[PDB]
Amino acid sequence: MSLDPQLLEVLACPKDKGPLRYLESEQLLVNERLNLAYRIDDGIPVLLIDEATEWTPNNLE
């Protein structure tokens, strides 16, 4: 199927257990349902319960 799935694998949220959306540009893992983001810091993705930071969510009224 081409590409390199080995260097990716499946990264899921520790709480939601859902697959995080991988941003290749800045190595960001965002849960699109909780609107929370996990950072991959120097090759190490910090997947913790409370280490999730607020990301740009849905717009307001």
Side-chain angles (χ1 to χ4, degrees):
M1 63 176 295
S2 300
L3 284 306
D4 198 301
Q6 195 282 276
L7 302 178
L8 298 175
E9 296 191 83
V10 180
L11 301 177
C13 174
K15 290 193 291 179
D16 180 53
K17 199 57 184 176
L20 301 172
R21 196 170 189 160
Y22 181 85
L23 286 308
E24 320 92 80
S25 305
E26 299 178 78
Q27 269 64 33
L28 294 175
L29 299 174
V30 183
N31 186 278
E32 193 171 274
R33 305 169 67 231
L34 300 179
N35 297 150
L36 298 173
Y38 298 86
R39 285 183 172 148
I40 307 177
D41 186 52
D42 194 53
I44 302 299
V46 192
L47 299 178
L48 294 176
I49 291 182
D50 191 60
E51 195 64 72
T53 175
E54 296 172 88
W55 193 241
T56 310
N58 186 29
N59 291 276
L60 298 177
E61 179 62 272

Short mmCIF file of all heavy atoms in Angstrom, two decimals:
data_model
loop_
_atom_site.label_atom_id
_atom_site.label_comp_id
_atom_site.label_asym_id
_atom_site.label_seq_id
_atom_site.Cartn_x
_atom_site.Cartn_y
_atom_site.Cartn_z
N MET A 1 0.84 -1.22 0.00
CA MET A 1 0.00 0.00 0.00
C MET A 1 0.86 1.26 0.00
O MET A 1 0.34 2.37 0.13
CB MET A 1 -0.92 0.02 1.22
CG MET A 1 -0.17 0.07 2.55
SD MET A 1 -1.29 0.20 3.97
CE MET A 1 -2.00 1.82 3.68
N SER A 2 2.18 1.08 -0.16
CA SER A 2 3.13 2.18 -0.08
C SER A 2 3.16 2.79 1.33
O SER A 2 2.60 2.21 2.27
CB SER A 2 2.80 3.26 -1.12
OG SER A 2 2.84 2.72 -2.43
N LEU A 3 3.84 3.93 1.48
CA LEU A 3 3.94 4.62 2.77
C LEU A 3 4.70 3.77 3.78
O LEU A 3 5.22 2.70 3.44
CB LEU A 3 2.56 5.00 3.32
CG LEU A 3 1.86 6.20 2.66
CD1 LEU A 3 2.76 7.42 2.68
CD2 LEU A 3 1.43 5.87 1.23
N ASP A 4 4.78 4.25 5.01
CA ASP A 4 5.46 3.52 6.08
C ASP A 4 4.60 3.51 7.34
O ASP A 4 4.72 4.39 8.19
CB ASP A 4 6.83 4.14 6.38
CG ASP A 4 7.74 3.20 7.15
OD1 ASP A 4 7.37 2.78 8.27
OD2 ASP A 4 8.83 2.86 6.63
N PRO A 5 3.68 2.53 7.46
CA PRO A 5 2.78 2.42 8.61
C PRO A 5 3.52 2.07 9.91
O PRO A 5 3.00 2.29 11.01
CB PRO A 5 1.83 1.29 8.21
CG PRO A 5 2.58 0.49 7.20
CD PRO A 5 3.45 1.47 6.47
N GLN A 6 4.72 1.53 9.77
CA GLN A 6 5.55 1.15 10.91
C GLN A 6 5.87 2.38 11.75
O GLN A 6 5.73 2.37 12.98
CB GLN A 6 6.83 0.47 10.40
CG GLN A 6 7.64 -0.31 11.44
CD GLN A 6 8.47 0.57 12.35
OE1 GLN A 6 9.58 0.97 12.00
NE2 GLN A 6 7.97 0.83 13.54
N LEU A 7 6.26 3.46 11.08
CA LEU A 7 6.67 4.69 11.76
C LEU A 7 5.47 5.50 12.24
O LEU A 7 5.62 6.63 12.72
CB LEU A 7 7.53 5.54 10.82
CG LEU A 7 8.79 4.86 10.29
CD1 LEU A 7 9.54 5.78 9.34
CD2 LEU A 7 9.70 4.44 11.44
N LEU A 8 4.27 4.93 12.13
CA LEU A 8 3.05 5.62 12.54
C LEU A 8 2.32 4.85 13.63
O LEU A 8 2.20 5.31 14.76
CB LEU A 8 2.13 5.82 11.33
CG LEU A 8 2.70 6.68 10.20
CD1 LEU A 8 1.76 6.69 9.00
CD2 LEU A 8 2.96 8.09 10.68
N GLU A 9 1.84 3.65 13.26
CA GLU A 9 1.04 2.81 14.16
C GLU A 9 -0.28 3.49 14.53
O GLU A 9 -0.68 4.47 13.91
CB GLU A 9 1.82 2.46 15.43
CG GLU A 9 3.06 1.61 15.18
CD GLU A 9 3.65 1.05 16.46
OE1 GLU A 9 3.16 0.00 16.92
OE2 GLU A 9 4.60 1.64 17.00
N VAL A 10 -0.96 2.95 15.53
CA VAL A 10 -2.23 3.49 15.98
C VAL A 10 -2.06 4.18 17.33
O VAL A 10 -1.74 3.54 18.33
CB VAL A 10 -3.31 2.40 16.10
CG1 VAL A 10 -4.63 2.99 16.58
CG2 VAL A 10 -3.50 1.68 14.78
N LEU A 11 -2.25 5.49 17.35
CA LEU A 11 -2.14 6.27 18.57
C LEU A 11 -3.52 6.71 19.05
O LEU A 11 -4.19 7.50 18.39
CB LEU A 11 -1.24 7.49 18.33
CG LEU A 11 0.18 7.17 17.86
CD1 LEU A 11 0.96 8.44 17.57
CD2 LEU A 11 0.91 6.33 18.90
N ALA A 12 -3.95 6.17 20.19
CA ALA A 12 -5.27 6.47 20.71
C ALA A 12 -5.18 7.23 22.04
O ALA A 12 -4.20 7.12 22.77
CB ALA A 12 -6.06 5.19 20.89
N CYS A 13 -6.23 7.99 22.34
CA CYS A 13 -6.31 8.76 23.58
C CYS A 13 -6.43 7.83 24.78
O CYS A 13 -7.17 6.85 24.75
CB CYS A 13 -7.52 9.70 23.53
SG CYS A 13 -7.84 10.60 25.07
N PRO A 14 -5.69 8.12 25.87
CA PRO A 14 -5.71 7.31 27.09
C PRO A 14 -7.09 7.27 27.76
O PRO A 14 -7.41 6.31 28.46
CB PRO A 14 -4.71 8.02 28.01
CG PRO A 14 -3.85 8.83 27.10
CD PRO A 14 -4.74 9.24 25.97
N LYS A 15 -7.90 8.30 27.54
CA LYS A 15 -9.22 8.37 28.15
C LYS A 15 -10.31 7.96 27.17
O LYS A 15 -11.10 7.06 27.44
CB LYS A 15 -9.52 9.78 28.67
CG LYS A 15 -8.69 10.17 29.88
CD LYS A 15 -9.24 11.42 30.56
CE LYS A 15 -9.05 12.67 29.71
NZ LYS A 15 -9.60 13.88 30.37
N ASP A 16 -10.35 8.63 26.02
CA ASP A 16 -11.40 8.39 25.03
C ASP A 16 -11.17 7.07 24.30
O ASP A 16 -12.11 6.44 23.82
CB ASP A 16 -11.44 9.55 24.03
CG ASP A 16 -12.50 9.37 22.96
OD1 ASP A 16 -13.68 9.15 23.31
OD2 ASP A 16 -12.16 9.46 21.76
N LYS A 17 -9.90 6.67 24.23
CA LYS A 17 -9.48 5.43 23.57
C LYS A 17 -9.74 5.49 22.06
O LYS A 17 -9.62 4.49 21.36
CB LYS A 17 -10.18 4.21 24.20
CG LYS A 17 -9.49 2.89 23.90
CD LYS A 17 -8.04 2.92 24.37
CE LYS A 17 -7.30 1.65 23.99
NZ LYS A 17 -5.86 1.71 24.37
N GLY A 18 -10.07 6.67 21.58
CA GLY A 18 -10.27 6.87 20.16
C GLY A 18 -8.99 7.31 19.48
O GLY A 18 -8.14 7.95 20.12
N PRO A 19 -8.82 6.99 18.19
CA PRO A 19 -7.63 7.36 17.43
C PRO A 19 -7.48 8.87 17.30
O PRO A 19 -8.42 9.58 16.92
CB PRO A 19 -7.85 6.72 16.06
CG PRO A 19 -9.32 6.49 15.97
CD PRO A 19 -9.79 6.23 17.37
N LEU A 20 -6.30 9.36 17.63
CA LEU A 20 -6.01 10.78 17.56
C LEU A 20 -5.66 11.17 16.13
O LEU A 20 -5.06 10.38 15.40
CB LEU A 20 -4.86 11.12 18.51
CG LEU A 20 -5.13 10.78 19.98
CD1 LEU A 20 -3.87 10.97 20.81
CD2 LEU A 20 -6.26 11.63 20.53
N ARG A 21 -6.02 12.38 15.74
CA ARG A 21 -5.75 12.85 14.39
C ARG A 21 -4.33 13.39 14.33
O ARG A 21 -3.97 14.32 15.05
CB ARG A 21 -6.77 13.91 13.96
CG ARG A 21 -6.79 14.15 12.46
CD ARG A 21 -7.98 15.00 12.04
NE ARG A 21 -8.12 15.06 10.58
CZ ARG A 21 -9.24 15.39 9.95
NH1 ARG A 21 -10.32 15.76 10.62
NH2 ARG A 21 -9.29 15.38 8.62
N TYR A 22 -3.53 12.78 13.47
CA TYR A 22 -2.10 13.07 13.40
C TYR A 22 -1.81 14.22 12.44
O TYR A 22 -2.08 14.12 11.24
CB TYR A 22 -1.35 11.80 12.94
CG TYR A 22 0.16 11.95 12.85
CD1 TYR A 22 0.96 11.77 13.97
CD2 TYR A 22 0.78 12.26 11.65
CE1 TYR A 22 2.33 11.88 13.89
CE2 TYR A 22 2.15 12.37 11.56
CZ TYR A 22 2.93 12.18 12.68
OH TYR A 22 4.30 12.28 12.60
N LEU A 23 -1.29 15.31 12.97
CA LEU A 23 -0.85 16.44 12.16
C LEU A 23 0.64 16.29 11.87
O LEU A 23 1.47 16.40 12.77
CB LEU A 23 -1.12 17.78 12.85
CG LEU A 23 -2.59 18.24 12.89
CD1 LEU A 23 -3.19 18.21 11.49
CD2 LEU A 23 -3.41 17.39 13.84
N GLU A 24 0.98 16.06 10.61
CA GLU A 24 2.36 15.76 10.22
C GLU A 24 3.25 17.00 10.32
O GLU A 24 4.45 16.89 10.55
CB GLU A 24 2.42 15.23 8.78
CG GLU A 24 1.31 14.26 8.42
CD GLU A 24 0.11 14.95 7.81
OE1 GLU A 24 0.16 15.27 6.61
OE2 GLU A 24 -0.89 15.18 8.52
N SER A 25 2.66 18.18 10.14
CA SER A 25 3.43 19.41 10.07
C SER A 25 4.13 19.75 11.38
O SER A 25 5.27 20.22 11.38
CB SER A 25 2.53 20.58 9.65
OG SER A 25 1.85 20.29 8.44
N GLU A 26 3.46 19.50 12.51
CA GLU A 26 4.00 19.90 13.80
C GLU A 26 3.94 18.76 14.82
O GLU A 26 4.13 18.98 16.02
CB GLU A 26 3.24 21.13 14.32
CG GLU A 26 3.36 22.34 13.40
CD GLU A 26 2.57 23.54 13.88
OE1 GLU A 26 3.04 24.24 14.80
OE2 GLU A 26 1.50 23.81 13.30
N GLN A 27 3.69 17.55 14.33
CA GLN A 27 3.58 16.35 15.17
C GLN A 27 2.58 16.56 16.31
O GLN A 27 2.95 16.58 17.49
CB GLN A 27 4.95 15.94 15.73
CG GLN A 27 5.69 14.95 14.86
CD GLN A 27 6.06 15.51 13.50
OE1 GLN A 27 6.34 16.70 13.35
NE2 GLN A 27 6.05 14.65 12.49
N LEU A 28 1.33 16.73 15.94
CA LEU A 28 0.27 16.95 16.92
C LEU A 28 -0.75 15.83 16.85
O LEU A 28 -1.12 15.39 15.76
CB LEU A 28 -0.42 18.29 16.69
CG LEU A 28 0.45 19.53 16.91
CD1 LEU A 28 -0.31 20.79 16.54
CD2 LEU A 28 0.90 19.59 18.37
N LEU A 29 -1.19 15.37 18.00
CA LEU A 29 -2.25 14.38 18.08
C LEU A 29 -3.48 15.01 18.69
O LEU A 29 -3.51 15.30 19.88
CB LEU A 29 -1.80 13.19 18.93
CG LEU A 29 -0.58 12.43 18.40
CD1 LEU A 29 -0.13 11.38 19.40
CD2 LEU A 29 -0.88 11.79 17.06
N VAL A 30 -4.50 15.22 17.88
CA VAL A 30 -5.68 15.93 18.34
C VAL A 30 -6.90 15.02 18.37
O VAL A 30 -7.18 14.32 17.40
CB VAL A 30 -5.98 17.17 17.46
CG1 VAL A 30 -7.19 17.94 17.99
CG2 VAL A 30 -4.77 18.07 17.37
N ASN A 31 -7.60 15.01 19.49
CA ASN A 31 -8.88 14.32 19.58
C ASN A 31 -9.96 15.29 19.14
O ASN A 31 -10.20 16.30 19.80
CB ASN A 31 -9.15 13.82 21.00
CG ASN A 31 -10.40 12.97 21.08
OD1 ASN A 31 -11.51 13.49 21.16
ND2 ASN A 31 -10.23 11.65 21.08
N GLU A 32 -10.62 14.97 18.04
CA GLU A 32 -11.51 15.92 17.39
C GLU A 32 -12.87 15.97 18.08
O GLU A 32 -13.72 16.81 17.78
CB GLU A 32 -11.66 15.52 15.92
CG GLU A 32 -12.31 16.58 15.05
CD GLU A 32 -12.22 16.22 13.59
OE1 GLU A 32 -11.19 16.54 12.96
OE2 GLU A 32 -13.17 15.61 13.06
N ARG A 33 -13.07 15.07 19.04
CA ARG A 33 -14.34 14.97 19.73
C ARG A 33 -14.27 15.69 21.08
O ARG A 33 -15.23 16.31 21.52
CB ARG A 33 -14.69 13.50 19.91
CG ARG A 33 -14.70 12.73 18.59
CD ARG A 33 -14.78 11.23 18.80
NE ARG A 33 -16.06 10.82 19.36
CZ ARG A 33 -16.17 10.05 20.44
NH1 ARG A 33 -15.10 9.70 21.12
NH2 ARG A 33 -17.37 9.63 20.83
N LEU A 34 -13.12 15.60 21.74
CA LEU A 34 -12.91 16.28 23.02
C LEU A 34 -12.29 17.66 22.81
O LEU A 34 -12.35 18.51 23.70
CB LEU A 34 -12.01 15.43 23.92
CG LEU A 34 -12.55 14.04 24.26
CD1 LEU A 34 -11.57 13.29 25.15
CD2 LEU A 34 -13.91 14.15 24.94
N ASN A 35 -11.70 17.86 21.63
CA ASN A 35 -11.03 19.11 21.27
C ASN A 35 -9.78 19.31 22.12
O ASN A 35 -9.42 20.43 22.49
CB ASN A 35 -11.97 20.32 21.43
CG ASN A 35 -13.17 20.27 20.50
OD1 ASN A 35 -14.24 20.78 20.83
ND2 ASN A 35 -13.00 19.67 19.33
N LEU A 36 -9.10 18.21 22.41
CA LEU A 36 -7.88 18.23 23.20
C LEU A 36 -6.72 17.71 22.37
O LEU A 36 -6.90 16.82 21.53
CB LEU A 36 -8.05 17.39 24.47
CG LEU A 36 -9.13 17.88 25.43
CD1 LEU A 36 -9.33 16.88 26.56
CD2 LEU A 36 -8.76 19.24 26.00
N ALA A 37 -5.53 18.24 22.61
CA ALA A 37 -4.38 17.89 21.80
C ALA A 37 -3.24 17.33 22.65
O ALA A 37 -3.01 17.78 23.78
CB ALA A 37 -3.90 19.10 21.02
N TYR A 38 -2.57 16.34 22.11
CA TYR A 38 -1.38 15.77 22.72
C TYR A 38 -0.17 16.10 21.85
O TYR A 38 -0.26 16.04 20.62
CB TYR A 38 -1.50 14.25 22.85
CG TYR A 38 -2.64 13.79 23.74
CD1 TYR A 38 -3.92 13.63 23.23
CD2 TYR A 38 -2.42 13.50 25.08
CE1 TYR A 38 -4.95 13.19 24.04
CE2 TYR A 38 -3.44 13.06 25.89
CZ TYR A 38 -4.71 12.91 25.36
OH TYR A 38 -5.73 12.47 26.17
N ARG A 39 0.93 16.47 22.47
CA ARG A 39 2.13 16.81 21.72
C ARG A 39 3.09 15.64 21.65
O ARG A 39 3.27 14.91 22.63
CB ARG A 39 2.84 18.02 22.33
CG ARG A 39 2.15 19.35 22.05
CD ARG A 39 2.95 20.51 22.62
NE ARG A 39 2.40 21.80 22.20
CZ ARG A 39 2.44 22.90 22.94
NH1 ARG A 39 3.05 22.90 24.12
NH2 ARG A 39 1.90 24.02 22.48
N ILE A 40 3.70 15.47 20.49
CA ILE A 40 4.81 14.55 20.36
C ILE A 40 6.09 15.34 20.51
O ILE A 40 6.42 16.17 19.66
CB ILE A 40 4.79 13.82 18.99
CG1 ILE A 40 3.43 13.15 18.76
CG2 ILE A 40 5.90 12.78 18.94
CD1 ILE A 40 3.29 12.48 17.41
N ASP A 41 6.80 15.09 21.59
CA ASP A 41 7.94 15.92 21.95
C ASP A 41 9.24 15.17 21.75
O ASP A 41 9.61 14.31 22.56
CB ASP A 41 7.80 16.40 23.40
CG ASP A 41 8.88 17.38 23.80
OD1 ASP A 41 9.08 18.39 23.08
OD2 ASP A 41 9.51 17.18 24.86
N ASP A 42 9.91 15.48 20.65
CA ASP A 42 11.21 14.90 20.32
C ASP A 42 11.11 13.38 20.17
O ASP A 42 11.93 12.63 20.69
CB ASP A 42 12.26 15.29 21.37
CG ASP A 42 13.67 15.01 20.91
OD1 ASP A 42 14.05 15.48 19.82
OD2 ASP A 42 14.42 14.33 21.64
N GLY A 43 10.07 12.94 19.47
CA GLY A 43 9.91 11.52 19.21
C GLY A 43 9.06 10.82 20.24
O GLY A 43 8.57 9.72 20.01
N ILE A 44 8.86 11.46 21.39
CA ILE A 44 8.10 10.86 22.47
C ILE A 44 6.74 11.56 22.62
O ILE A 44 6.67 12.71 23.05
CB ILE A 44 8.85 10.94 23.82
CG1 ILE A 44 10.22 10.25 23.71
CG2 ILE A 44 8.03 10.31 24.93
CD1 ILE A 44 10.13 8.77 23.37
N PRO A 45 5.66 10.87 22.23
CA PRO A 45 4.29 11.37 22.40
C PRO A 45 3.83 11.22 23.84
O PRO A 45 3.74 10.11 24.37
CB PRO A 45 3.46 10.47 21.47
CG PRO A 45 4.43 9.57 20.76
CD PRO A 45 5.67 9.54 21.61
N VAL A 46 3.54 12.34 24.48
CA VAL A 46 3.15 12.32 25.88
C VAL A 46 1.65 12.05 26.01
O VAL A 46 0.84 12.98 26.05
CB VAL A 46 3.51 13.64 26.60
CG1 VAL A 46 3.37 13.47 28.11
CG2 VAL A 46 4.92 14.09 26.24
N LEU A 47 1.29 10.78 26.05
CA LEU A 47 -0.11 10.39 26.15
C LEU A 47 -0.48 10.13 27.61
O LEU A 47 -0.22 9.05 28.14
CB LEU A 47 -0.39 9.14 25.31
CG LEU A 47 -0.14 9.30 23.81
CD1 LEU A 47 -0.41 7.99 23.08
CD2 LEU A 47 -1.02 10.41 23.24
N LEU A 48 -1.06 11.14 28.25
CA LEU A 48 -1.50 11.02 29.64
C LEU A 48 -2.92 11.54 29.78
O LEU A 48 -3.46 12.15 28.85
CB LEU A 48 -0.56 11.77 30.58
CG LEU A 48 0.86 11.21 30.67
CD1 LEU A 48 1.73 12.09 31.55
CD2 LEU A 48 0.84 9.78 31.21
N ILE A 49 -3.51 11.32 30.94
CA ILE A 49 -4.90 11.69 31.18
C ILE A 49 -5.07 13.20 31.26
O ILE A 49 -6.01 13.76 30.70
CB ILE A 49 -5.43 11.03 32.47
CG1 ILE A 49 -5.56 9.51 32.27
CG2 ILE A 49 -6.76 11.64 32.91
CD1 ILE A 49 -6.11 8.78 33.48
N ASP A 50 -4.13 13.87 31.93
CA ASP A 50 -4.27 15.30 32.20
C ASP A 50 -3.19 16.11 31.47
O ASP A 50 -3.10 17.32 31.63
CB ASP A 50 -4.22 15.55 33.71
CG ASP A 50 -4.62 16.97 34.09
OD1 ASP A 50 -5.76 17.37 33.79
OD2 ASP A 50 -3.80 17.68 34.70
N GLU A 51 -2.40 15.43 30.65
CA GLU A 51 -1.34 16.10 29.91
C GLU A 51 -1.87 16.58 28.55
O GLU A 51 -1.11 17.04 27.69
CB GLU A 51 -0.15 15.15 29.72
CG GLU A 51 1.13 15.84 29.29
CD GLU A 51 1.66 16.80 30.34
OE1 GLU A 51 2.17 16.34 31.38
OE2 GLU A 51 1.56 18.03 30.13
N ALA A 52 -3.17 16.46 28.37
CA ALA A 52 -3.81 16.93 27.16
C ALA A 52 -4.06 18.42 27.25
O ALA A 52 -4.62 18.91 28.23
CB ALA A 52 -5.12 16.19 26.93
N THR A 53 -3.63 19.15 26.23
CA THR A 53 -3.77 20.59 26.23
C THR A 53 -4.96 21.01 25.38
O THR A 53 -5.39 20.28 24.49
CB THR A 53 -2.49 21.30 25.73
OG1 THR A 53 -2.69 22.72 25.64
CG2 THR A 53 -2.04 20.76 24.38
N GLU A 54 -5.49 22.18 25.68
CA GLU A 54 -6.61 22.73 24.93
C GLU A 54 -6.16 23.14 23.53
O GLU A 54 -5.12 23.78 23.37
CB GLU A 54 -7.20 23.94 25.65
CG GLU A 54 -7.80 23.61 27.00
CD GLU A 54 -8.18 24.86 27.76
OE1 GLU A 54 -9.33 25.33 27.59
OE2 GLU A 54 -7.34 25.38 28.51
N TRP A 55 -6.93 22.75 22.53
CA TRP A 55 -6.64 23.14 21.16
C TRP A 55 -7.79 23.98 20.64
O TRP A 55 -8.82 24.10 21.31
CB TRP A 55 -6.42 21.89 20.30
CG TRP A 55 -5.83 22.19 18.95
CD1 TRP A 55 -6.39 21.94 17.73
CD2 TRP A 55 -4.55 22.79 18.69
NE1 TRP A 55 -5.55 22.35 16.73
CE2 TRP A 55 -4.41 22.88 17.30
CE3 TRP A 55 -3.52 23.27 19.50
CZ2 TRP A 55 -3.28 23.43 16.69
CZ3 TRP A 55 -2.40 23.81 18.91
CH2 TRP A 55 -2.28 23.88 17.51
N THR A 56 -7.61 24.59 19.47
CA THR A 56 -8.66 25.39 18.85
C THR A 56 -9.91 24.55 18.60
O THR A 56 -9.89 23.63 17.78
CB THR A 56 -8.16 26.00 17.53
OG1 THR A 56 -6.89 26.64 17.74
CG2 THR A 56 -9.15 27.01 16.99
N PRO A 57 -11.00 24.84 19.31
CA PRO A 57 -12.23 24.08 19.23
C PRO A 57 -13.19 24.63 18.18
O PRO A 57 -12.79 25.35 17.27
CB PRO A 57 -12.80 24.25 20.63
CG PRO A 57 -12.37 25.61 21.06
CD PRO A 57 -11.12 25.95 20.27
N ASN A 58 -14.47 24.29 18.32
CA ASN A 58 -15.49 24.78 17.41
C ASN A 58 -15.76 26.25 17.69
O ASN A 58 -15.50 26.74 18.79
CB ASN A 58 -16.78 23.95 17.58
CG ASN A 58 -17.84 24.31 16.56
OD1 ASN A 58 -17.54 24.73 15.43
ND2 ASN A 58 -19.10 24.14 16.94
N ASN A 59 -16.27 26.96 16.69
CA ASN A 59 -16.55 28.39 16.83
C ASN A 59 -17.79 28.61 17.69
O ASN A 59 -18.57 27.69 17.91
CB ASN A 59 -16.74 29.05 15.46
CG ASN A 59 -15.46 29.11 14.65
OD1 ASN A 59 -14.65 30.03 14.81
ND2 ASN A 59 -15.28 28.15 13.75
N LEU A 60 -17.96 29.83 18.15
CA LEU A 60 -19.07 30.17 19.03
C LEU A 60 -20.19 30.84 18.25
O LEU A 60 -20.08 31.02 17.03
CB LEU A 60 -18.59 31.07 20.17
CG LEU A 60 -17.54 30.44 21.10
CD1 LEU A 60 -17.09 31.45 22.14
CD2 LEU A 60 -18.10 29.19 21.76
N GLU A 61 -21.24 31.22 18.95
CA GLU A 61 -22.40 31.85 18.34
C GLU A 61 -22.04 33.17 17.67
O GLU A 61 -21.25 33.96 18.21
CB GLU A 61 -23.49 32.07 19.39
CG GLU A 61 -24.75 32.74 18.86
CD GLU A 61 -25.44 31.93 17.78
OE1 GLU A 61 -25.10 32.09 16.59
OE2 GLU A 61 -26.35 31.14 18.12
#
